[PDB]
Design a protein around this ligand. Structure first.
Ligand code: ZN
Length: 256
């Protein structure tokens, strides 16, 4: 599977029939039909002890991976019951600044989208959690092009070392707090992973406030490659799945 004409999102259902399922992601967030939910408890992003380990080009994005063997960087509160441990983050981005995000807001596409992926500690490990309807919580953050995001520059500067599929690099002491906007106002709905295997195990929490990154920062993402070393160059761009049918779901807002 990939993002091209012959293996991209419109083809995924042949190997992954859940692609046409009842709770697929991403979706368009219609801000005029999402409803404020006063039963939502406050969202807690506790990243002070986060322990990054490595950055990896997996041929569809790059993942910054974290030590998840203890409660050190966790998401709680909001729509969540229990404690979800950060395992990795990655991004989806476009070839042009007018596309790249997976979720859309009143059909608006952002230049990119950050996914911080967490798993429910009640299930013991990530591989078991993805088999559960409440296994994962993914915090989604939109990126727009404007001012540089200083807390992103350490990621930008390492990309030269992981240009091609399969390459990895040490990436310790990276603080993911530097990627968060001021406001934690969010929308939430039940959905799926947005890459194969497309499992329907995600509580999505999508922040309303985008972060700004500079044109130079996003241009460096666009220099990555989908191919491995020694293969014909295919720029890693447009690695986003479009919006899927909402079906029988409601999107709730944390804010009035
Ligand atoms: Zn993602």
């Amino acid at each position: 599977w990939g993002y091209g004409k012959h293996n991209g999102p419109e083809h995924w259902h042949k190997d992954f029939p859940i692609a046409k399922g009842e709770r697929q992601s991403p979706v368009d967030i219609d801000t005029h039909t999402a409803k404020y939910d006063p039963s939502l408890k406050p969202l807690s992003v506790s990243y002070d002890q986060a322990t990054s380990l490595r950055i990896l080009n997996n041929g569809h994005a790059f993942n910054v991976e974290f030590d998840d063997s203890q409660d050190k960087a966790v998401l709680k509160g909001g729509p969540l019951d229990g404690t979800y441990r950060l395992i990795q983050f990655h991004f989806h981005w476009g070839s042009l600044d007018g596309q790249g995000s997976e979720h859309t807001v009143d059909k608006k596409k952002y230049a990119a989208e950050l996914h911080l992926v967490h798993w429910n500690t009640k299930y013991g490990d990530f591989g078991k959690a993805v088999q559960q309807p409440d296994g994962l919580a993914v915090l989604g953050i939109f990126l727009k092009v404007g001012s540089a995001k200083p807390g992103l520059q350490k990621v930008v500067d390492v990309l030269d070392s992981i240009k091609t599929k399969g390459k990895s690099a040490d990436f310790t002491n990276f603080d993911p707090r530097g990627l968060l906007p001021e406001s934690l106002d969010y929308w939430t709905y039940p959905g799926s992973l947005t890459t194969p295997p497309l499992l329907e195990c995600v509580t999505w929490i999508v922040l309303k406030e985008p972060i700004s990154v500079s044109s130079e920062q996003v241009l460096k993402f666009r220099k990555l490659n989908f191919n491995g070393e020694g293969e014909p160059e295919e720029l890693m761009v447009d690695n986003w799945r479009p919006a899927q049918p909402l079906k029988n779901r409601q999107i709730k807002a944390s804010f009035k």
